[PDB]
A paper describes a structure:
To this aim, the inactivated mutant Ffase-D50A was expressed in Saccharomyces cerevisiae, purified, and crystallized as previously referred. Thereby, the enzyme was directly incubated with purified fructosyl-mannitol or fructosyl-erythritol to obtain the corresponding complex, and was submitted to crystallization experiments. The formation of Ffase-D50A/fructosyl-erythritol complex was clearly detected. The fructo-conjugate is spanning subsites − 1 and + 1 in the expected product binding mode. On the one hand, the fructose bound at subsite − 1 is fixed by many direct polar interactions of all its hydroxyl groups and the ring oxygen to Asn-49, Gln-68, Trp-76, Ser-111, Arg-178, and Asp-179 amino acid side-chains. A water molecule is occupying a position close to the missing nucleophile carboxylate acting as a link between O1 of fructose and the Ala-50 NH main-chain. This binding mode is highly conserved within the GH32 enzymatic family and determines its specificity for fructo-based substrates. On the other hand, the erythritol moiety is accommodated by polar interactions between the secondary hydroxyl group next to the fructosyl linkage and the catalytic Glu-230 and to Asn-254 side-chains. Furthermore, as it is described in more detail below, the terminal primary hydroxyl is linked to Gln-147 through a well-ordered water molecule that participates in a network connecting residues in the surroundings of the catalytic site.
The β-fructofuranosidase (EC 3.2.1.26) from the ascomycetous yeast Schwanniomyces occidentalis (Ffase) is a robust glycoside hydrolase (GH) that releases fructose units from sucrose and inulin (hydrolytic activity) but also produced 6-kestose, 1-kestose, neokestose (all trisaccharides) and blastose (disaccharide) by transfructosylation of sucrose (transferase activity). Ffase is a butterfly-shaped homodimer of 160 KDa included in the GH family 32 (GH32). Each subunit of 535 amino acids presents a bimodular arrangement with a N-terminal five fold β-propeller catalytic domain and a C-terminal β-sandwich supplementary domain linked by a short residue segment. As with other β-fructofuranosides of the same family, Ffase performs its enzymatic action through a pair of key negatively-charged amino acids in its active site, namely, Asp-50 acting as a nucleophile and Glu-230 as an acid/base catalyst.
Numbering used by the authors:
A (entry chain A), B (entry chain B): 24 to 535
Write the structure that this text describes.
Amino acid sequence: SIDLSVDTSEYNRPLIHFTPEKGWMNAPNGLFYDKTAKLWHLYFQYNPNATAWGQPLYWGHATSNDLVHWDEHEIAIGPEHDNEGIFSGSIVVDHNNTSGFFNSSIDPNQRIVAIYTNNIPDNQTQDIAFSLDGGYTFTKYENNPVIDVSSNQFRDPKVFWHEDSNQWIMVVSKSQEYKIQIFGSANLKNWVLNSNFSSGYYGNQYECPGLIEVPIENSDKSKWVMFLAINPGSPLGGSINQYFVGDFDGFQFVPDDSQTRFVDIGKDFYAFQTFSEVEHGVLGLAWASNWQYADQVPTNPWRSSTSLARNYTLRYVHTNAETKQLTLIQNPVLPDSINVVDKLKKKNVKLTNKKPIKTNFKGSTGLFDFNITFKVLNLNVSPGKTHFDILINSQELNSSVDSIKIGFDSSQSSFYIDRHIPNVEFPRKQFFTDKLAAYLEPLDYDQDLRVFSLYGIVDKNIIELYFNDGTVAMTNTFFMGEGKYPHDIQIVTDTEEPLFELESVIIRELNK
Amino acid sequence: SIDLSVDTSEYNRPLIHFTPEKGWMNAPNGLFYDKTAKLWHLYFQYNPNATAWGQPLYWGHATSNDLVHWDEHEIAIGPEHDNEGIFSGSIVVDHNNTSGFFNSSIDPNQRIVAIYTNNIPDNQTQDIAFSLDGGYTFTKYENNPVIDVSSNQFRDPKVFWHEDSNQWIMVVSKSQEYKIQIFGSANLKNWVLNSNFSSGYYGNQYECPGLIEVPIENSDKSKWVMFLAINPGSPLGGSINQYFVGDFDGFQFVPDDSQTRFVDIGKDFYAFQTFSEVEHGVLGLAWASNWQYADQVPTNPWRSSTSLARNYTLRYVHTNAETKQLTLIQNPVLPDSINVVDKLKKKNVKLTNKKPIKTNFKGSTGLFDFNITFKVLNLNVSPGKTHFDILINSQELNSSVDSIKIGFDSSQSSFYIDRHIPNVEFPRKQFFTDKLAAYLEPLDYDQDLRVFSLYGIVDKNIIELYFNDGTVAMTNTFFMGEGKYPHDIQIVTDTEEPLFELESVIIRELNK
Ligand SMILES: *[C@@H]1O[C@H](CO)[C@@H](O[C@@H]2O[C@H](CO)[C@@H](O[C@@H]3O[C@H](CO)[C@@H](O)[C@H](O)[C@@H]3O)[C@H](O)[C@H]2NC(C)=O)[C@H](O)[C@H]1NC(C)=O
Ligand SMILES: *[C@@H]1O[C@H](CO)[C@@H](O[C@@H]2O[C@H](CO)[C@@H](O)[C@H](O)[C@H]2NC(C)=O)[C@H](O)[C@H]1NC(C)=O
Ligand SMILES: OC[C@H](O)[C@H](O)CO[C@]1(CO)O[C@H](CO)[C@@H](O)[C@@H]1O
Ligand SMILES: OC[C@H](O)[C@H](O)CO[C@]1(CO)O[C@H](CO)[C@@H](O)[C@@H]1O
Ligand SMILES: *[C@@H]1O[C@H](CO)[C@@H](O)[C@H](O)[C@H]1NC(C)=O
Ligand SMILES: *[C@@H]1O[C@H](CO)[C@@H](O)[C@H](O)[C@H]1NC(C)=O
Ligand SMILES: *[C@@H]1O[C@H](CO)[C@@H](O)[C@H](O)[C@H]1NC(C)=O
Ligand SMILES: *[C@@H]1O[C@H](CO)[C@@H](O)[C@H](O)[C@H]1NC(C)=O
Ligand SMILES: *[C@@H]1O[C@H](CO)[C@@H](O)[C@H](O)[C@H]1NC(C)=O
Ligand SMILES: *[C@@H]1O[C@H](CO)[C@@H](O)[C@H](O)[C@H]1NC(C)=O
Ligand SMILES: *[C@@H]1O[C@H](CO)[C@@H](O)[C@H](O)[C@H]1NC(C)=O
Ligand SMILES: *[C@@H]1O[C@H](CO)[C@@H](O)[C@H](O)[C@H]1NC(C)=O
Ligand SMILES: [Zn+2]
C-alpha cells in the first residue's frame, strides 16, 4: 500500500542514521557484533507493506562495519500468519553451545540466537530462533514458546550471559503490571522467574527493558544499569526511555537510590537497546521517533530512522553546585570513515550582535555537526539578551527559508531547542512539542567563569544534542517544507558587548 | 521601581485567582483557617518594590471568607536587614500553648505560630514568630533560630501537629542534598532530626516539602502523601511539584512504592502548600507560574497569581486497561459566591464539522468554565480528524482574535493544550512550552464506548484543566496581545460524521 510516486529522500532522508529503503520501522532489535565477520548487526520492527505499523510484522536487518554506513538485507524473521508479528527482542552469541544448536562448523563468535516476543491474537510469548549463516536467516526452535505466562502483555526480552551466576539472564516486560521480570536459564530454552522489578515513572506500560554493566570513567569498576521504555505517559508526552543505577547478582537488581532519570530528554528516543558482544564498553541506539506522531510525519516511501550509535559510560557530575551524582553519559559513535566536505573552525571568539558566526559552504549534503566550548563572561545585559542561538537554515525555496534554533540562556543555565516550522502540517502535530529545554551545571570553571560544551549533529530530519561532553542527550526529529533541508549554520546573539566567549567552534559539512 | 503608569489589569488580571495589587509574588506561605473568625489566610513571598524577586523579601498577607474573594492586608513579616528575606514557611495553631507564647486572653483557635526560613548572606535557618491579633502582626521568638545546621541550602518548613505521636512535625528541604528532613518537637522551639527522605525526580534541588494525611474516596481509610517541589530540572522544564503515597508514624515516611508522579502536569503549578486547620479533607494551592519565565510575563504592576484552592483525595484509577493505582485526585474549590452571568447547555450532541458549539454571550468578564462529558464512537476517520478542539477566543481587536486551544485525540487517548500566541514576545519565551499533553484511560465505558470528562476554568491569564473528575490536573498561564482577553468559546471537529458524542456540555460566563 506504499505510494512509490512520492519520494521525499532528496530533502529529508538521513545520510548516516539507518532508514529502511521502504515501509515502516520502529524498535531496534537483535543488536550484536560479529567478531569473526567484523560486522555490526541492526534488526528492527519492520512493516514492508505500509509507512505505518501493521501485521504481519517482521525483523528487518542491516549491517555496518563502522555504525554509520548501513547495508539493508533481506527480512531475517517473519511470523507464521498475517495476523501475527515478530515483536522486539535481542540476540546473544552462544559461544559454548549451551543451546545445542551449533556444531564445530559454526565459529563460536557466530553462534547466533534471537530471543523475541511472538505476538498472536490474545497471546504474547518469548520464543527463540538460531542462525547458521551469520545472522541473515533464522530457524525457529521447534519447542517454542520458551516462556508462556498466558498473557497478551508480556514482551521485549533482552538476554545476556551472566558469568558470576553462570547462566543466561532475560529481562522482559510484564507491560501492564509495571514489572520488569528477570528470568534465568542454563540453555536459552528452560527459564525460571528469579525476580520482579518496579520503579521510576510508570506511565501507561513498561516496554523494552535492558540490564547491562556500564563502565565508570577512569575506573575498572562498573555499575549495573537497568533501562526501561514507557509509552504512552512520558512526562514529555508519548514515549521515553529511563534508567536505574545499581547492582545485580544474577537474580535481583537493587538500585543504589530510588530516583527517576531519563536516558534522553528529547521527544524522539525510544526502545533503546545495547549491542551484544561489545569488547570495550557499552554501545546502543534507539528508535528516533515518538509514538504520538511517528506514523504521520511527512516522509515517503519510508518512516523512521534509528538514532546514531552511542557510547555509554558513568561519570560523577554536579547536578547542583553542592552535589555530584553518578550519571549516565552518552557520546555519539562518529568514525573517521565519515567525509568532511567543508569546515569552519574558530577559537577565542567574543560573540556580539556585530560578530555573528556564519558558514559559507559551496553546497549542502544536509548533514552537519557543530562542536562548541563556551564561557559565560561577567556582563549584566537586559533579560531579553541573556542568550545566544545556533540557527540551522534551509536553502531559500519558494521565497522562504525554514530554520530550527538551538540556544543557551546564561540566566537559566539551560539549553533549548525550537523545532517549530510554520506552514508544515501533518496529523497529530498538536503532540509535536516544539520547545524543549535542558538545565545543566557548568562543565567546568575558568577562574569564576562558567564553562559549558555542546556537540550537535543534524542529518536531514533529525538533530541529536550532547550537552557537557554527553552529560545530557536530547534527540528530536524536524520537518522542513517540501524540498528544504539544512544548508547553513549561524551562531548569533543580540548583546552589544560579549556575554559569551566561544573558546572553540568547529562546524563541519559531512558526507558518507 | 514599579511603573504604576502602565496597568494591564483590565485584560490580564485574574478575577478569582489571588494577585497582589502591586509588586512580585512567588510561593504561598502560612496557609491556615481561623475557626473563630471563619477566615482563610494566605501569606506569600512578596517583593513590594519590583515585579521581580528581590530582597528585602516579606510575607505578604490576604484573607478570604470563601477562597475566591481576597482582601489584601499590610505585610505580616519582614526581615531585620535589606539583604535578608523571610523565605517560605507555614503556620500552625498551638491550641494547647505548647510554645508558651499564649495566655488565657488568646482564643485557642487563634494561637498562631509562623515557622519560616530566615535567609541572610551565606545562612538559611528555621525561625518562629507568634501573632496575638489573629495573624496580622507577628513577634519573632527572642531565641531564633530554632534550627541551624550551618547551611545556606536549608529551607521551606511545613509544620503540623501529629496526634498519633503527640508532637509537632516539621518537613523541611536540605535543598541541594536532595533530602526532605523530618524533625519532631514538643514546643516548636527544640527540634530533633528523626529521618531523611530522598526519592523521585531530583532535578537541581528539593524545595517546599509537605506531608499530610489524605482521605481515600468512598472509605474511612487514608494515606500519608509527601509533597515535594523541584526547580530547576523539571522534566517539563523549570519548576514542578511531585508526590509520594505511603505511611507515617511520626518519625519516618515509608512510601508504598518507588514510583515518581507529578501533582500537576502543566508548566505553572509550583511550591504547593496545604491549609492548616481544615476540618474536612485536605485543601491547598500553589504559585501559578514557572521560574523559567515568571519574572518576564507581560503583567504590570504585579506579577504572579496563585492557583485556585483545590480539594485533595486519593482514588483507585486505571493507569492502563489492566491495572489500578491509588492516585492523587484534585478538584477546584468554586463556591456559590461565584455568580453565573450566562450559560450554554447542550446534551447528547453528535459533534461534526457542520455542528460546532459556539457561545454567543452579550459581553465578557474574561472568566469562563466548561464542563464536558463525552463518548468516543466507533467511527473510522482519517488520522488528521481523530480529535475535537475547545477554542478560547479573545474579542476581535484591531482586526485580530487571539486564541488558545484545548483538545482531545481519540487515537492517542490524550488531551492537549496549545497556548501558542504568536506576536506576544517576552524575555525567556524560548522556555514557555506551548504544547502540553495528558494521557488518560477512560473515566468509564458505556458498553464498548470510552467515556471521558473535562472541567476547565479560564480566568483572564490562567487556565486550569481537570481531566476525568480530577484524575489529572494541568495549570498554565497564557498571554494574549495588549487589550485582548477571553470572550467566546467554540467546540469544533473536522469529522464529517460523529466520532465524539458530547453527553453533557455546560459553558458558563462567571463573575465575582
Ligand atoms: C567507546 O568508548 C570507549 C572508551 O570509554 C572505548 O574503549 C576503548 O577502546 C579501545 C579500542 O578502540 C581500547 O584500546 C585497546 O585496549 C587494549 C587493553 O588496554 C590494548 O591492549 C589494545 O592495544 C587497544 O588499544 C581502550 O582500552 C578502550 N578504553 C576503555 C576504557 O575501555 C571504545 O573504543 C568506544 N567504542 C567506540 C565504538 O567508539
Ligand atoms: C473537600 O472534599 C471533602 C469530600 O471529599 C468534603 O468533606 C465533606 O464536608 C462536609 C461538610 O462540608 C462534611 O459534612 C462531610 O462529612 C465531608 N465528607 C468527607 C468524606 O469527609 C469537604 O467539604 C470539601 N471541602 C471543600 C471546601 O470543598
Ligand atoms: O503494541 C505494543 C504497544 O503499542 C507499544 O507502545 C509499542 O510496542 C513496542 C515498543 O514501542 O513495539 C514492538 C511492536 O512493534 C513491541 O515489541 C514493543 O513493546
Ligand atoms: O532560593 C531560591 C531558589 O533557587 C528556588 O528555586 C526558589 O525558592 C523558593 C521556592 O520557589 O522561593 C522562596 C524564596 O522566595 C524559597 O523559600 C523557596 O524554596
Ligand atoms: C507484506 O510484506 C511481505 C514481505 O515482503 C510480503 O511477502 C507480503 O505479501 C505482504 N503482505 C501483505 C498483507 O501485503
Ligand atoms: C553441522 O551443522 C551443519 C550446518 O547446518 C550441518 O550441515 C552438518 O550436517 C552438521 N554436522 C554434523 C556432524 O552434524
Ligand atoms: C513476580 O510477578 C509475577 C507476575 O505478576 C507474579 O506471579 C510472581 O508472584 C512475582 N514473583 C516474585 C518473585 O515476586
Ligand atoms: C568535540 O570537540 C571536543 C573538544 O575538542 C573533542 O575532543 C570531541 O571529540 C569533539 N566531539 C565530536 C563528536 O567530534
Ligand atoms: C521595600 O518595600 C518596603 C515595604 O513597602 C519599604 O519599607 C522599603 O522602602 C522598600 N525598600 C527598598 C530597598 O526599596
Ligand atoms: C496576656 O498577654 C497580653 C499581652 O500580650 C496582655 O494584654 C494580657 O493582660 C495577658 N492576659 C493574661 C490573662 O495574663
Ligand atoms: C540526615 O541527613 C543529614 C544531612 O545530610 C545527616 O547529617 C544525618 O546524619 C541524616 N540523618 C539520618 C537519621 O539519616
Ligand atoms: C461538572 O459536571 C458534573 C456533572 O457531570 C458536576 O457534578 C460537577 O460539579 C461539575 N463540576 C464543576 C466544577 O462545576
Ligand atoms: Zn507559530
